[PDB]
Point group: D2
Chain length 254, copies 4
């Protein structure tokens, strides 16, 4: 139970977002939630989805993780509005569509560095600023994909940025561990979301899971959220620097 606990959830675009899976689960367990968004359209979606939640107050902050000033001021404002928090769910990534299909060897520098910036660096700066609101410790979770551990077709520039993210989680775990702040990753299997439309061959990936993965079925957003609940809570206190696969066992097979 997560009553009297407060979590910042970053990166809901709409009802299919993985972060909205997380939100539904933490809200059901009684947490207070704060939400961050980039696009105006995502604030609108967030105001609509809050009616499904039991949060008595909408706490919505615009944070583009490309901007230091936005991350620093956003968290500073969260802290002024709700006090100390207990953890952060990071559910944010981006790459240019043309870097998620075709040949990897042709990725542009700005494309590679944009992926890195949003998808991996954002976690370091978020952790640095969120730590100011966790004086007594807490928990930070980021969303990764099996394409960060192995070359999968079409995932390209995002795989290299997932590899970077998963290491960023381990370096943060080491750095922040003596502050009693745990940092972990959830490696979600494929899920139909807005961002998934940019992964060439997504539908093929989906069915390969059904066909080959141990559980012979795809996972959904709520399953990711139930693992997020474990990682964000005291159920997982001994656990830091870890990557938990919520992917029907696919990571364990070949």
């Amino acid at each position: 139970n997560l009553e009297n606990k407060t979590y910042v959830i970053m990166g809901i675009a709409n009802k299919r977002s993985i972060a909205f899976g997380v939100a539904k689960v933490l809200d059901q367990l009684g947490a207070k939630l704060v939400f961050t968004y980039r696009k105006e359209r995502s604030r609108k979606e967030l105001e609509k989805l809050l009616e499904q939640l039991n949060q008595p107050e909408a706490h919505l902050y615009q944070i583009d993780v490309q901007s230091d000033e936005e991350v620093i001021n956003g968290f500073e404002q969260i802290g002024k509005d709700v006090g100390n928090i207990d953890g952060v769910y990071h559910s944010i990534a981006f790459a240019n569509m043309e870097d998620l299909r075709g040949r990897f060897s042709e990725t542009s520098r700005e494309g590679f560095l944009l992926a890195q910036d949003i998808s991996s660096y954002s976690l370091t700066i978020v952790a640095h600023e969120a730590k100011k609101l966790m004086p007594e410790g807490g928990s930070i979770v980021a969303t990764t994909y099996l394409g960060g551990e192995f070359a999968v077709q079409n995932y390209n520039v995002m795989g290299v940025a997932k590899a970077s993210l998963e290491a960023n989680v381990k370096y943060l775990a080491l750095d922040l561990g003596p502050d009693n702040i745990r940092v972990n990753a959830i490696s979600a299997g494929p899920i139909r979301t807005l961002s998934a439309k940019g992964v060439g061959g997504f539908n093929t990936i989906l069915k390969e899971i059904e066909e080959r993965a141990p559980l012979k079925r795809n996972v959904d957003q709520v399953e990711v959220g139930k693992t997020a609940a474990y990682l964000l809570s005291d159920l997982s206190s001994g656990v830091t620097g870890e990557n938990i696969h919520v992917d029907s066992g696919f990571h364990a097979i070949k």
Copy 2:
């Protein structure tokens, strides 16, 4: 909440067993529990340990995992007395003490096959027998150590037996996944227990976690039990063939 769940916990020897840590967490959460032990000396012990839980019944069965018939009849009796189960915590391993120190290259065939048998194969046979009591599915968790993934001073024959176990998990996950039976490992940090007295250099291992692991501290039997509650419940429903390190972040550093 594990009310109306039944779990079989294997491998309680005394108050310091990891499995009594698991027992305690699941008991607090409303689980009915069934226990298995090897020798009477653990039985009498066991019976007194249970007056610290709120099981209204002492469901207790002798099972030496070296005998097929005792594992077969043991699970058979468990089903007759308490019907279907929701999963199994496996907390069982053994090696002869001279193989847990000195030079690995001098391990005997007998001692090697004995560690494999008790520490690894026993999950396969237990899985096959447990499954008969999980027609709607369920969850199997084994306990492993970082020694299965890396060579570690002294742990020697038990490291090749853990490597074996960790692969056994994976292969059981693939096999039993279509029956909705999930199989996972918890990789526990070092913990002072009866078995840990057999491991050469054990105190040096304890101390090194405190100096070097991200959280700068040792884990305990209840932190293992907490993660076992995650793995054994529906929070982990999309998680299988997984190895979760409950070890203060130690797996994640070098």
Copy 3:
């Protein structure tokens, strides 16, 4: 690589398609003196005629069933008297009953599970203990594994567990023997048509998936495994121990 003046024990040739025979042709091509161990008389007969293909001046052949402590102990002790000190050992030995290489892993028998471990994993430990006696100045031991030990693969079953055990064995052997300057490593070979592959269910599907999905879009062969063996058994790999080199067209790196 120059292997003139060097002597290697290659264990586990049954016929011309053996992975160890690939190893043998490369080392032989490289100037090395080779010693061979076999279990079955039929395998010794294959060695006898496969040796006409090689440049070995004489046939050093020893029956070693790795299930027997006596046979491993006396075979290496014999090897040491006949050829003197050795430079390393190529281990290419596995076994599992056929029932245990298809269908349901969860049905595996104890006797079948310990059989696969005994032959395919423990044999490396004892072979190293006895081989070390002949490498007073250091040396190099290489064993043969499969991706099935790092991931659950359909049908590979009791063997993938035996290969996990093997790969841990190499690391623990590496740590123990490193002070003696004896390096210990694994080659993880892609699928190759051999006599033992005949017992692994869906083998043909395995080979086809490699060709369609692995980076190199082709299968590897025994000689390619031999080349990496030559690297691993020679001074080119000084500094490398406890390592598992995958010779598999890149397959291990993709999902």
Copy 4:
């Protein structure tokens, strides 16, 4: 090995202690023609002194700052006009600010993080793209990584996230370029005292932990990295791709 008639581009020699200079001594001794690329004028100057221990009859030296596309694009094009087709590339380039390396990882600045990615990871992708034009019939590309990419090690900080990225880059490049018969691999070198190492906090106690704890109980040197690179750049390692080979006395295999 045997490498006469092969031409390799070697990127990242600064001085006589560079890991790349060890690669180059091994390749040169094996008969290869070598082409060198450098960033700083002082590195060129060192290259010219060092070529003198080499059996290279021609200094082929090209300035390439891997921060600039046009420099990588033009340098390789120029290399093509000067030596023609090439057999492989040794990439031995990384960089990170002292200001981010020697403060807490969580305080790494955006520009510092992205500097290290750009120079130490992205540089391989663009180099691979331009090198491929000179490998019509296949080739081999090797980059230099460090255990810090796979585990959080104290002090290495922003460079371990850059190495993690580099190591994914190898895999993704091996997958993309394998159909062109171009193999891409990494060497994970142990600590070696170089100009760059002077940037890594606590470097001396890292050297000492290797002597004390690594299976081989010693450190490795640049020449050892060069020997594993000759294996990787040569037909010895055909069938090997997307691989990370650890030249670290086996320190990767232990805990």
